[PDB]
Structure 1
């Protein structure tokens, strides 16, 4: 009743969001796993930034914003952050002060802020990387030398992968005074997010809706899930070794997109046991959030 875990995956699409650099100038995608196969990942900071952006999208106050300015990457300080900030700072955000301003911001609020509340993890492609690549760029040269760029024009490679990746997340129920209004917006945003990449002029894909399962339990952060889905998407096997033996109990699962599989007989027996009666993932977050909340 005070903890909520979940995992989200998406639809197949090519890849993007490179980070590394090459001496010979081929953009490279991140690699982590060393067992004879490669995988592509995304750091949590990117999706945290996207969540901040869509919190900005809905009417929500904030003390942090990204400004498009000179080449140096900077963020607007704005005014002194307060824990009673309506949308962002209360939700998360850690501030560390070298001098601690003046007398601990005049003996107000708390000096160091704990993010807590929201958690995230890696995103794993759950599909091996392949050496496929495409050489694409043939830049131009000015014919009038008006703000001319580099003199030469080169030809370099870029690679994509037809892949869909998943990620887990979690949050604990601790505050209910002002939290519910912002938690509703947070769940609405996480139910539909976009971006989490740099290159969107090319390689456009969005990863909000797919088969989602969440668990609201007072387990104090213990999860039976292995945090891994099927490559084909029929990850349901972990339920079969569990659901038939209800040792998780009857009200320890939810349902998402996978429920619209044509088979129906075991859906009926699980309907009397689990409340996975939702076929639209957007509808799922509208109701189960209320159950997680005190009211």
Structure 2
């Protein structure tokens, strides 16, 4: 069977994400370091919520809708997680550990087991500096209104960083009942990927992908160095040189699919040279996802 997995990156821009929930005077964004340098941010689970929301706006069932009425966030549910009557959030009937028992396994024969069929990892930035502020401020109303917010005035500052960052993911799934429409919708929705890290009316960021690269779609898991291309520089072109070399003389090549940035500004002669099988060269990244889904899904 076919297994596919890909990597993307977004355009450079300023950004900042609420990540502390620890202190009020100052905000911290830095999460994890590399080789003695702090240049990585962002959580590997917020994009799950972003995908869920986008799937909600695309007409698939609203199985789990976030509601904001209480002080602490709570999420409602339907009658019960069912991976057959509906998409079950891409068939995400998850663990229900409680002493009540009396689960559907004895009534609806539902073992409560998951159908994950998805893989994702935390993003990593490419710029190390996180020691700049903006020094905004908040006022005191004192307007004799019925509500006073803080009854004080403060001079609190925030931290932002201008960076572009990469993102790997894997699927490694297989077609089943009601899957082709749902997997096709997932591949359609991953193209946009907006509204990440909740609402942000002061900083606006997008996850529109450029230079998307997917690896080894028909073959079994053999990929390596998912975090390869970086520093606004192409790196998979030498990977094709060293892994599954284009010529079938010392290392036979493989079916690859390449994004738009790596071919928009790159040597014209190389396009003709990279024609042992022609690979898959496209101008806009969104164009190739439909064809890739058609090929991998088989229909």
The reply to whether TM is greater than 0.5 is yes
- Structure 2, unmatched stretches of 5+, are none
Q: For residues 185 and 100 of structure 2, what CA distance do their matches in structure 1 show?
A: 32
Asked if the contact 2:7/2:226 (under 8 Å) is kept, the reply is no
Change (3 A) 1:109 1:214: farther
Asked if the contact 2:92/2:114 (under 8 Å) is kept, the reply is yes
- Structure 1, unmatched stretches of 5+, are none
Q: CA deviation at 1:68?
A: 1.6
Change (3 A) 1:38 1:88: same
Change (3 A) 1:177 1:105: closer
SS of 2:257's equivalent in the other structure is coil
* Count of residue pairs brought into register by the alignment: 295
- Report Cα offsets for 1:149-177 as digits up to 9, x if no partner: 11111011111111011111111232333
Q: CA deviation at 1:291?
A: 0.8
Runs of 4+ in 1 over 4 A off after TM superposition: 21-24
Q: For residues 9 and 283 of structure 1, what CA distance do their matches in structure 2 show?
A: 17
- Report Cα offsets for 1:129-157 as digits up to 9, x if no partner: 33111111222323114111111110111
Q: CA deviation at 1:104?
A: 3.6
Q: CA deviation at 1:219?
A: 4.8
Change (3 A) 1:24 1:180: closer
Greater CA deviation, 29-38 or 283-292? 29-38
Bigger strand fraction: 2
Q: Which of these residues, 271, 277, 284, is aligned with residue 273 of structure 1?
A: 277
Q: CA deviation at 1:99?
A: 3.4
Q: CA deviation at 1:191?
A: 1.0
Change (3 A) 1:169 1:34: closer
TM-score, with structure 1 as normaliser? 0.90
Asked if the contact 1:62/1:87 (under 8 Å) is kept, the reply is no
Q: CA deviation at 1:26?
A: 0.5
TM-score, with structure 2 as normaliser? 0.89
Q: CA deviation at 1:124?
A: 0.2
